[PDB]
């Protein structure tokens, strides 16, 4: 019991790596929102939905992450 | 027993670092869309459904990691 | 319980992995500010409140990798 | 025999590292063929073939280490 | 007990990884004040606040990161 | 004989990771092809073998990483 | 006590992979100095000062990476 | 000698992972050869040979990583 | 002190990963320069000592980690 | 004695790891070297040694690596 614990306390630490994807991902989706409003200020509108978009899957392999850490710490 | 069980878990946790790829790669996908609409709002309806495969594509690098994830968790 | 300690220990260094992540991205968001603005001044009040989002999504990534990393700390 | 399970488990989770490879790749593939049609329109029809190929190619380095993926979990 | 403060250390040079993210980012955010100066010095007043603030917000990151290891350590 | 087994399972999986750099690189010479012909659709048959020749170059390091994971399996 | 000692080593060498962040960091930096220059010689006095500024601050994260990796060594 | 043979074929594996940067290397290489002659066909005859030379001392790095590997699996 | 010895050995492995880090930004330093100069050759004189002390405080960091490399060596 | 042995082999290949920064570097350059010539033919002459330059300076710190390899594996 004390070794499968502790597999689950060093796999929930590792489950956490994955989450620098979506930590840079998330960036490089506003960094192209900034640069396409600032080149082309009237296509904002059209853009920002396709920013909240990106940004939302990108965040959600994160989040798959997240959840087999949760899984590990708890379930 | 307990010496498997626990590999399990902790291969189940190594198999969520390749989850990274598609993080990045989605939001590539995306930064070009935007960037392409920017340049050429004209062109909107054609690249969006090549986003639309692009990420999609992307994603499912992820979900085969994930897979693995939980073929070893369950 | 030497195992599981040590365990929880060695999760939570590993949980830090992640905050390079958002290191990056943060830094991403700042540097298409920084573009955007320079290359139409006029910009600014528009692209900087998307450049908070930017940083406080990107952020949030940090945010739960820290989180894991306490709670084995600690939790 | 604890030893050789455990470390198929554990090797099975590793070997999917790699996939964030095609992850990042197909994406990168996508982007060019959005940014391409974005600028010039008319080449859609000759760079779209090209970014199929190109995910084809970066997808099978995805699918290696999948393969080695199985071949230790079974 | 040696076991446990085996890990403590262990953790502590694990901990400090994560830095990396910082000293890149802390980079990026200086070659965009640069080459935004460079391209338009008039704007350098506006664009200076801004990589003050983004460098902060990306060193945070990796102060986070050292706190963990100090908290192994001490 | 136990773990010696183990250590080649582990180092199979291991081997898989720089299989990575060929998805990514791969990716890399398909996007300049496809940004180069879209700029210049007139240099297509000149840069297509270069793309060919490029990304096998790319793939073979990727070939490399997976012949020593066969290696350690069989 | 061979444990201990043991981890306070292997820990040192952890330490040091941060490092990499300021070697790419402070590359960075000097990129963006020399690209800038280049483009724009008459603002080299305005610029060096923060490519200066840049490397000090990317260099610090090098800094405290090897302070831990000293502190695990003494 | 269980061991040492057991190490020397994790390092074999481990020895690998280098073999990433000539993967990644030889791609940025004859990208730049794609886009100088897209942007400067005339060029083409200068820049092949740059391209040649490029990917051989990329390349050689992963030449080194797999030579490790082979003595421990075999030397 | 078998143990001790080895956690040294695996130590000082492991402290050479960072001199990625200066691989990667002495040739960013580089290709800067040379982009520069392509650009701008009246530039040269001015952004070469430029290129110089970037790749040396690169480099700098990589030597930090063959330095903890060398002291668990010997 | 087996316990020293085989860390000599993992630290030996883990060694390797550091030179996909040569490998990726020395690519840099040329691409550099590509562009810069395909925008500036005429400049071929002032720019091709300072990719010598770049290419040796950055293949030293790859050199480093092995330099730790061989000592491992041998000395
Ligand atoms: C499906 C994947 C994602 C969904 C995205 C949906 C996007 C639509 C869009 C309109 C957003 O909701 C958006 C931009 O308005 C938004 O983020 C809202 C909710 C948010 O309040 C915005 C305005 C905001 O100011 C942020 C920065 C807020 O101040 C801070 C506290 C939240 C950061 C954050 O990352 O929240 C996440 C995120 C929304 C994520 C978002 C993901 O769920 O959700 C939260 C809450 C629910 C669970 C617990 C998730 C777990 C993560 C790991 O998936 O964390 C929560 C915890
Ligand atoms: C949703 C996720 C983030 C929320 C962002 C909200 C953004 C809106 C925006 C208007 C902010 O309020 C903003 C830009 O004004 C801001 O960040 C303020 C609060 C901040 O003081 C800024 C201006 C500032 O000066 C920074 C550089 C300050 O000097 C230093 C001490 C703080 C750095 C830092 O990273 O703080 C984090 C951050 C705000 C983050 C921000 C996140 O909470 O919060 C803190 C506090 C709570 C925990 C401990 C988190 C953990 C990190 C990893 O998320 O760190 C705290 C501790
Ligand atoms: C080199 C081998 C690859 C072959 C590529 C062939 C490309 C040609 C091109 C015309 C395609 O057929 C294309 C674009 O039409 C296509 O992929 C079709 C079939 C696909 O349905 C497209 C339209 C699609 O909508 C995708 C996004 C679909 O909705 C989702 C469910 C599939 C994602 C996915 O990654 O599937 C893969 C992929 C095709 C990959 C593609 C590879 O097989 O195959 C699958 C099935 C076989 C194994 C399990 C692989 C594992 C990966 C990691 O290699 O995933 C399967 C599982
Ligand atoms: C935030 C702290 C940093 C401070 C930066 C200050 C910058 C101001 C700026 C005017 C400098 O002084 C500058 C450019 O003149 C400079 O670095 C001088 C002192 C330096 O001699 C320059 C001209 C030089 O030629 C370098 C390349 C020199 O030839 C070589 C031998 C030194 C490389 C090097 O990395 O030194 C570091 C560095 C200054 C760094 C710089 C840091 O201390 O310090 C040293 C000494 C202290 C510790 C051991 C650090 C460890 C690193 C990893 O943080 O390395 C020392 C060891
Ligand atoms: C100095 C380092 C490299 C030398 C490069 C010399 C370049 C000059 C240039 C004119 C070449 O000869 C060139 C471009 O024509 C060439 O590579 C030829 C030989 C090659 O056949 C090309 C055109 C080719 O078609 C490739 C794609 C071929 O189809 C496939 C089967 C080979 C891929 C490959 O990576 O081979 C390597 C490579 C040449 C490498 C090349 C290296 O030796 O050699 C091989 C053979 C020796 C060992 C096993 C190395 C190990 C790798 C990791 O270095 O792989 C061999 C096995
Ligand atoms: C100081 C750091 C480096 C020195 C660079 C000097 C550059 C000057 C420049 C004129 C070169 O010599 C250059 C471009 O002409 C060159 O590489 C020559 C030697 C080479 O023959 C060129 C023309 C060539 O065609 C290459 C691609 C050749 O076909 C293949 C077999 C060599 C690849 C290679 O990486 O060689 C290395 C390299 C030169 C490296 C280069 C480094 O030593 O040297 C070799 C031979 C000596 C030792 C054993 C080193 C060990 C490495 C890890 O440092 O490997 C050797 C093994």
């Known amino acids: 019991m004390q070794l499968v614990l502790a597999a ?3 796999g ?5 790596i994955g989450l620098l994807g979506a930590g840079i991902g998330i960036a ?8 396409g409003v600032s ?10 939905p396709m920013a909240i978009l ?15 850490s949760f899984l590990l710490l708890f379930g």
């Open 8 to 10: 689950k306390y060093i």
């Open 12 to 16: 929930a630490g590792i489950s956490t």
């Open 54 to 68: 990106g940004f939302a899957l990108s965040e959600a392999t994160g989040l798959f992450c997240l959840m087999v």
């Open 28 to 35: 490089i989706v506003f960094a192209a929102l900034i640069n």
């Open 39 to 48: 080149r082309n200020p009237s296509i904002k509108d059209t853009v920002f």
